Design a binder for this molecule. Sequence first.
Ligand SMILES: Nc1ccn([C@H]2C[C@H](O)[C@@H](COP(=O)(O)OP(=O)(O)OP(=O)(O)O)O2)c(=O)n1
Ligand SMILES: [Ca+2]
Ligand SMILES: [Ca+2]
Ligand SMILES: [Cl-]
Ligand SMILES: [Cl-]
Ligand code: NA
Length: 320
Amino acid sequence: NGGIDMLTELANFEKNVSQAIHKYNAYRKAASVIAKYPHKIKSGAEAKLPGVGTKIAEKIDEFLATGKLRKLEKIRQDDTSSSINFLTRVSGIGPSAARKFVDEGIKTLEDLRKNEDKLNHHQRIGLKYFGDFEKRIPREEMLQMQDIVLNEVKKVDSEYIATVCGSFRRGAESSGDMDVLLTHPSFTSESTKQPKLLHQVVEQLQKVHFITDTLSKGETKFMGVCQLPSKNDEKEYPHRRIDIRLIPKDQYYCGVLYFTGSDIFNKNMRAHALEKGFTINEYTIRPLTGVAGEPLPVDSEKDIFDYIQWKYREPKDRSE
DNA sequence: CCGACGACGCATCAGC
DNA sequence: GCTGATGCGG
DNA sequence: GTCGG
Ligand SMILES: Nc1ccn([C@H]2C[C@H](O)[C@@H](COP(=O)(O)OP(=O)(O)OP(=O)(O)O)O2)c(=O)n1
Ligand SMILES: [Ca+2]
Ligand SMILES: [Ca+2]
Ligand SMILES: [Cl-]
Ligand SMILES: [Cl-]
Ligand code: NA
């Protein structure tokens, strides 16, 4: 049901143009439930699955009959809408900044490059590598990036453990970018016994010229840019987005569940936890006046599934 | 009908 | 400077 | 935009 892409374009419109985040999540939920439905949908009535209601069923009926959606056709022709949608593809430009740029007449890639002085630091790096960040990463390259990260982390301190998460851990043949969960025994929910734990790793990866740029950096989260080294006379590899998350070592299982995703899977799982009277974040699962109690004991990813009475789903089956 | 929609880190800004 | 809200991101 | 109660 690849064509019924339609829902994704509608979601993107609502987020970027309408600034209607709940419509955006509604369409993405519908897109997700349809994407795992194992038959070729033949009518909106059939599609009207949890999260598909009347309005999306009507849109699906139009799309099946004609191959297009007039609502999208109008959105694709509208210059302001299409310009706002385009500017949000630069990392760091969201729907508010995109509309502000378009209001000032900044509407194309050319315009951004001419007006670089008007971008914050994140946006400037997102513009700089705009083309590269569009490309996906083949798993073969992800494997090499994994080896660099884990080996350099080991050189800093053999007690670190770095785990590559995201779509890579879900077994995807290509990834949007690299996600690294990092733990160290000196950083638990009970204490922080060593400072600079994330900084020293970031610094080492910069020192060997793997990390090339920083988008944001605090005590526990790094978001930046990296690049594989290339061989003599070879074209350079594209620059890649890299995220590193330092998680308390005793909260690894909640963190690797979060960082493995997908984002929709996490949303569904956490919503379901709420219905079961728990709340899950990347640190803890806590029972719910609806006030979170104390963290429940967790010794495995499966324990989190057990609490909310879901059967265990391996990462490869979490790609929603 | 209508409340409720996952959860949170870092950058930036207003107000102080 | 800090605090809280907002924007943007994973 | 959708849905449980
Ligand atoms: N709104 C979001 C976005 C992401 N994540 C979590 C689950 C994701 O799997 C992980 C990494 O986010 P990514 O944006 O890198 O996406 P993926 O790694 O899943 O896919 P890809 O990088 O291949 O596009 O962060 C989340 O919980 N909520
Ligand atoms: Ca991405
Ligand atoms: Ca990723
Ligand atoms: Cl269309
Ligand atoms: Cl917590
Ligand atoms: Na963006």
